[model samples]
Target: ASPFRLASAGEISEVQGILRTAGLLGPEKRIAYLGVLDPARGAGSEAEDRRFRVFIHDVSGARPQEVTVSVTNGTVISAVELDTAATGELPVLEEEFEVVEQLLATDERWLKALAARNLDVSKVRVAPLSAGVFEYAEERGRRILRGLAFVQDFPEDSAWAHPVDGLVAYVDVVSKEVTRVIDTGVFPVPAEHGNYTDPELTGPLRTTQKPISITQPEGPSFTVTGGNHIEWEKWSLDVGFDVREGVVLHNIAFRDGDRLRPIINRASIAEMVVPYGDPSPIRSWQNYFDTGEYLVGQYANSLELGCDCLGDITYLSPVISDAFGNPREIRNGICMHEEDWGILAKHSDLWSGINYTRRNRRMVISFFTTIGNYDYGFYWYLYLDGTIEFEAKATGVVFTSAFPEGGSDNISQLAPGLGAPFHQHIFSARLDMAIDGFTNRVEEEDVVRQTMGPGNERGNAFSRKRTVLTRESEAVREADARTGRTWIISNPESKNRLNEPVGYKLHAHNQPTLLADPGSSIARRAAFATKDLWVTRYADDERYPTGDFVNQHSGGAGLPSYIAQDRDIDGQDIVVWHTFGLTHFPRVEDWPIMPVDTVGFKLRPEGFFDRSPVLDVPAN
Candidate 1:
């Protein structure tokens, strides 16, 4: 077992007691566990231990003061205090829901205006955003938190489709007072009940005669140590929950005989951006830094058996501590299980008078999160064939708005009055891969036409144009599906028995790149998603592509900042970032509970293995 601990609840309580005794958890202070970033790990050898960095900030002060605490085992090693121009760590807790609601109730002008539209204050949904310090900047940091308000008419309609139009309110976080309110008169008609709630009025309820299910009669075949620590067959990983990034995997590895091969040292959904094209007020400022603005895990849905998943599913819940250092569970935060992956490898030999088929299976770890109206289900699947897949499925209702359509016949309705404007949902994944070892290289290969060649029986056939990116500056590339684009990660020194470099390859498909103009406000904010792939040298601090602090942040930080150095990436520990999204032009069919939009990438073995890893099998 690894020496690094996941701050056991017992350890958490112990750390809490230590902080409380040290007066670190004073009335003005708060503590947040920044996770115990494990020591630099290599091969199967036991690495050194690392300290848990706990971030503590002062809530009572106007200017933010950061305090870092280091702990080993159950003992406090040291505590350091530092003050910078930057505000300390800011994590919106579940309490902010009530806090913002209280502030909204006191705004009489907003209430009066809302009532004019026949909207009730009780059915209001307030999403708090980092005010971005418009006027006093830092003064607005903690003193006044701004909330983007919306109208959720009863439980019958999705509020996202019916924005309060152009409305934003500032609330004094501590005093819980509505400091200011802004509502542009450009109010778009809310798409109220845009057939999303329409039922089978003309027929009886549909029935499911046959249902799909997963069976594990012998009970679960895997093991879990610390709730979040898991081991299934040859794969093992530790799950982590970040405020911005939902579920994160740490120290992921696969056992190859006596060697524990390093796969993805760290992996997670770096940042998610939902950009809109509508120029209308609310829709105009419709760009959302979902992960930045709203913490996904904060809205994570608790999974259930026979519904969200099947078979023996183990659930792991995370505890998010507030400023008072009290821990509360983010229930059903993660679900883990083994799934039957269609036929893995099969073949028929008529000479043998028999058809042999091998069954495919995968170890899946999943979690679901919601942002406003849409839901995103993320999955990390591992195959015995040395393949890994990151899948993102989008569900829930579409974000619709009212269109001024005159009384017309044969009107195109995903429904009447609803014009689901073009929107883009972009997702980026950060993969730190160590193929065989850390020193690895990435080669971008594309199929190109050899048209320049003489006609000597050589027509305009295609040939491979491979480019080995030497440094970070040349690492950024785009997805040209027409060119058969792909990237390979291989170690220079390590070679498989086949005489090829030990490596893995990346393959992503059916993904639409960001459609927003390069210079557009939304595009600039999400600069990372502008390209398809980015490779950079490894740095512990460079975890997020859009930088760590994304709330209210326009472009410029993140990937651009990290790669500005253009460091040498050849034969070094590198991180791979991929961007994929959908250019959504919603139709009537995508009303209530829209079909699952799937976008995924595969980490398949290139030459990492000498022979087939799943060849040993008997068919039924």
Candidate 2:
């Protein structure tokens, strides 16, 4: 027999009403029950048998008031007030016995059905699991006993196999009473010898190897060098190309571009360039006395002799291509890189190869990097045929606007019509390129300006800048004379025209101002009133910074003032910082990696392609 008879629905309704009437529910109040504690699990089981206590609260008040109501024999045993201010502010009461009786009848019907089937309910045991509670559900007339069992053992022969146990099972409560006992043959048994072992039933053994490999592949090759360095984070480099009258193939096409074309073309490229630490040496070449110049000197001196991808190691490039017939040059290129390669790989199943249809005049190349965290960086390039076009694409950090200080009064006093502006930051970049057999050329770019201005009335602003591309080596230096200036070209006639150069600058205009002087009780009361009044733009727990008290105030220094943290820039929080690092929002078109359908892109003959006869160089 159960010690605690189920409370009547009327009794439950009365308790709910009492909580509602005691100023718990009103015009602007919101309530949430953190959890419940069952007295049956306590030490004084006999004393607690007929009595149960419920914890209730009103979150709207200054501080929460916890009220404990004790019930016995379907009546109120006692109502104990804890940390409460009122004695007569009694809770209202209502009756719901009819609902409770119906629920009990449903439960009994299920029990009768199990009894008719000769299934026993006494042998089943319930176990506790993390973050959840298990109990009997009698409302649905299913006589199903549900329990959550946290299976922590490894290499175990159980259905659940997780490092952090969270296994929940629903079984017919009377399954234990079946007398037929016919062997189902599907039942699992302890392994003894050979491939089967007893430990398999208990936990993972020494010989079991986890079947997953988290390593990422080194990226693609690029012909042009300079601006924004790429790394082997949770990102992949996918190369797709077509050679007129020749075969060009990519070893890996894990993720291609066609899947991203719909969204990428619609997004503002000006908004994508992410800035990092410092400017490139070539841009600040005039500052020869600073340590920054010394760093540039070291890089220049090393690349002066010859270009080697492994030895020099100044920059990393992925997504390379080549043209076969006559001579061809690429004018624009896009490559994605990050710090968390594992997450990118997981999202890989959603990417579709770039869609390239044979065209008489133009060729298209596209790919995507699903951003995971909020502040990580992504890089892109524009090429004239296979040569460096001296342009880039970057994404800004994500963050929530700060709350105005001094509560509601302050909000009313400040610029009444203006709302907080959301902004992101960029730091630095490095780019390196190697042509056919020529030495590698490298360039680096960093944000020198960061500020907010009236964006074209469209709410958009240019916020990141990159350095121009330059060739390395004596031979490449001579080759540069024929290549012209490998700098960003903003003229109308150029194949790669970019927006005006903009740099990183911090914005401090939105800091909230206090309305009333300090130490006044009105200020305190206003502070209390404003706590639950502010509206959030995104879903609960989904907004950047997450806004929970734990993430907001747990760190000793307090919430981060900037969108991207220093640790995030250092790649420690790669998944949390870069959008492409953590999430893979799937689309319908992504199917097979190498889709059964054929796809390709063509390069138009241009000044860069006509500069030299690329076909003269034999294939490696």
Candidate 3:
């Protein structure tokens, strides 16, 4: 005879026997059994033998707990927590009940919506609910059954909570279920230590006995000579090294009339839009299209024409200014400003360049000119805005160091373990000019001078004053959000090639040098290559390709293929320059407008480069 009985007390003893055999019961253990047998199965049959167990542990403060329940019989096998404060569990149980009710409400709404849409809810199957606040229900005919319900807790915040804070839910349409609910935390993970190298301090009196020779590569057909040195007939500009007051100096001359005009005009437009709390004009101008309108071939043609006009005026400013400023006034002479000519005539007959050096966490730029015969010199310093911006301001003649002997690559090999590879260094350069006398041109009085603080302050005070100036400059950069590090390699040879307006090719390696052949090296050492070098146009679904234009009329051509073709050209280096603007609306009280302000760029290091050659630097 079987010890277990479906309708009698014998079933309890049978369950106890099983528990005792399983070592779940002690020599003296009390258990209560709740059994609900399936009517479809007969008494004393295998199907009716399921049992639920409840136990109470009364040895001192031991609490009552639910031990086990049978899935087949729908019974509680054991129950505890009666002896423990019911008050303690009530809150948790009540919260669970509230969650279940909320789930039911949500399921009810989803069901109604589905029914309205005439969807067949019967096909919905409840998948296993992962831990989270999930509720799912499906209707078969007139009966509705719960599909899934669970809750989840994650370590990081998810997308639904972004641009806004608080909890978000993900729901499944087919299962009629809530997949996950996330509660975004208040604070985010703090940014890790950035790629910032502290400026090294040197003693006041330091001397190096070892002879350091700075060599410009010979095969380039370029030379440095006493007085005026002539090389290739490429329209090139060189800012010479004038170590004045221990500072490296270079003269930077920009076509002020055309370049400065648009910069100021754009700044004005930004000012105009900002006061109205609208950045639409700037965004539209950048996108080269209206928000609602599609850009077509005609629109693109028109845009190109406009750009050509601007470029013609702006890019030719230097030549125009030069032609006009010549002492001998020939036929068809071009002179926009006599004052500018006066400044140009003083300097040697060469394009101006700015001298720069990294000192006290800043890159200082001193402006000097050597056009026809005179040398007009001024000083400025470039400082960082917090951990991001690269900015500049004028200061007195203060210099620090020179480009290390041998070239940039030699310096890179010295700092291997410090940061990223040598080639991946973020190189940013800028030319700052002040159009002081032009009545038509915008002018800001003592902009750089006041920003750098009152003249005569020395030592760290100058540095500290510049720090304040950088903080103020940050507002402009922040408004732009495009102020980030970009990489550039200065190739005087390449510059000569580019001046021809002919297409120039980029080599994977600085070829024709001692560096390993790019292809062979790449084959030998595959790990050193920069990951971001080849930017695919199709890499992102949201953005259009670089050179592709939209058809404004149809608004359906989508993105163009210019970026794809350009990306296919192997081993290319791209340069991007950006500026920021803000327009304060003129109330009746505000007049004459403030100085149109601008910031500079910085060359920092990036993480894309490793220690070795990527593939191999290509051979020339």
Candidate 4:
């Protein structure tokens, strides 16, 4: 049996029952999140030793509590009440999100605010925004959400296209009241109803395209065992699903002859935050922690073959808990397939009149999630040549607002009167490194160009410079494309044939980190996004990049706090947190439905292998 299997429906139901019987879950309380808790970090344990972790929100007391239950033994491991003022609360649940819309429908102030614009409550979509820490009078230390209005002329109309800007609603879910409302001068909604799905709106589909079918009559080469365990080519790994971080890879190793060479102990796109850049009062507090505040795995999309995946595919379903603590299955939550990826190695020797080429293929493990106005896809590819790649694709309706004719610098006019604000999608990936073993060290490598001097007589000399990141504080680094910078995680005890430590190099895209001001609230809360890389000693409690409690959280938590001890990471079991993402300045072409924008990084074998790893592949 795979040790990484997520919590099952039976286990979840039993755990919920146990919690309810213990008075931890009831009508007065809501289950904010539930997931399978793996054994303690670095512990050698069986799957049966796993437990269930639950986050509960006590509506009556307006507080958050957590309970860890061992369903196998029907015992409570730990039950603790959290301080909302210190740790903040869990993500906003669907119950809370829906409650805001219902509560607003009856409020006279909200009704009057809509009536001032000559709009009706039924025709609007009140978006529940995560009230980030702005130190506001009513929002601080309280369970609150900021509501923004968007008009939906028809059921099929896009609410994002018709934003009723300048009106804001501060909602308190615990008290079941709209605490206050702010109304600036009303702005006109865009007349254009952006419904690209309707054929009547768009003239016609492109007719010149021909379908090129992809068939795997012999089925895929990958063999799946124990549901979550997979073996494809030289890659072998176990997949684990989480409520916060979805599609985690565990015990990822490469098959090397008789032994399995360990690569990554565990890896996942841990967290991401989208922060809008606008000076407008209504848009200033517009930052969202998608995975933390809204649980991306909870809202994962179900996939259909031939549309979401092409070739012979295997789908893995993971069970998750609903807002009411009931077991729910996300069928086809993870898609696995093999794809032909051009050439791995090719050579033509004119002397021997012979040609040698090896076609490359990759194993793709992917999933997609839709969070309100945006749809995101996470794709992980394992190449035949020992290269691991991850790509995050963003595509969906852009969050928009109405603007004046001449738009401001921070806004892009998607259509007439429709302005899309600039924003940054900052993602953090947690890589628990096991280059060849657990005791791994990280070093930064940069190509240094030599000055025209005695060392560079030809004036075209350059050398590689490697610096050891000995401590956690010194390892907080940025990506530098100028010197072709990259970081390598290597096991000092494991030596390759070349007498170098077996290592994997991290090739990150030289993109900007979070652009919020250093003193800004978002800057502190999303501190992991401020640096391109963070190396820390692995702690069982140090799981999330933004800490466990992110909703309405203050700053200086997560990675910043985890590394505060400044522990030496050299030759220690360390975790590498890499921040990579897109800084979008929307264009006119991004209107209606934005095209998929992809950003990712790669981990390739630097000294992990002796020679070409795929040279033995047969020519087909």
lDDT, each prediction: 0.71, 0.21, 0.22, 0.89
- List candidate 2 segments past 4 Å from native: 1-398, 403-424, 427-429, 440-620
Point to the candidate with the largest lDDT.
4
Residue 10, model 1, lDDT: 52
Per-residue lDDT for 1-620 in model 3, tens only?
Answer: 22121123344444445555555455333332122222221243544435443332322233424455453454445544542221111001111223332443456554553344343344222221111111222211111112221111122211111111122233432233554444332222111211112123222434555653323233323232331121211211222211111111122112222331110100000000001111221111111111111111101111121221211110101100011111111111111000000111112334556432221222222322211111122223222211113222211111001122353332121121111111111111211111111111110111122243456454233221111111111211111112221222222222121251111111111111112234331111111111112222122221221111121111111112223233321222222112222112222111111122333332221211222112221222
Tens digit per residue, CA lDDT, model 2, 1-620: 22322233343455455545554434433222111112322334456533323433232233323444443334444444433221111111111112222232234443453344343433211221111011222212222222321122333332121111111233222222111111111211111211124554336756766554323255333321223221121112223221110101111111112221000100111111111111211111000100010111111111111211112122312211111001122222232222211111112233685432221110112322222112121223222122111111222222111123443211111122111122112111111111111121222223344345454455454444433222111111111212221222111112211232211111111212222234432222122111110111111122122111110011211112222222211101111111111111111121101012111111122222223223222222
What are the clashing pairs of model 1?
Answer: 414-588, 547-558
Give the local distance difference test score of model 2.
0.21
RMSD of each: 4.0, 30.1, 35.7, 1.3
TM-scores for every candidate against the unseen true structure:
0.87, 0.17, 0.18, 0.98
Tens-place lDDT per residue, model 4, 233-271, is 989999889988888999999998887999999999999
Q: By TM-score, who's the top model here?
A: 4
From the highest lDDT down, the ranking of the candidates is 4, 1, 3, 2
User: For residues 162-267, could you state the per-residue lDDT of candidate 1 as single tens digits?
Assistant: 6564566777676566876777664554654433445642255558668766688888868989656778767888877764577888877878778888777788
- Greater TM-score among 3 and 4 belongs to 4
> What clash count goes with each model?
2, 73, 52, 0
Kindly report which residue stretches of model 3 are placed more than 4 angstroms away from their true locations once superposed: 1-566, 569-571, 577-580, 583-590, 595-601, 607-620
Candidate 2 accuracy as TM-score: 0.17
lDDT (Cα) of model 3: 0.22
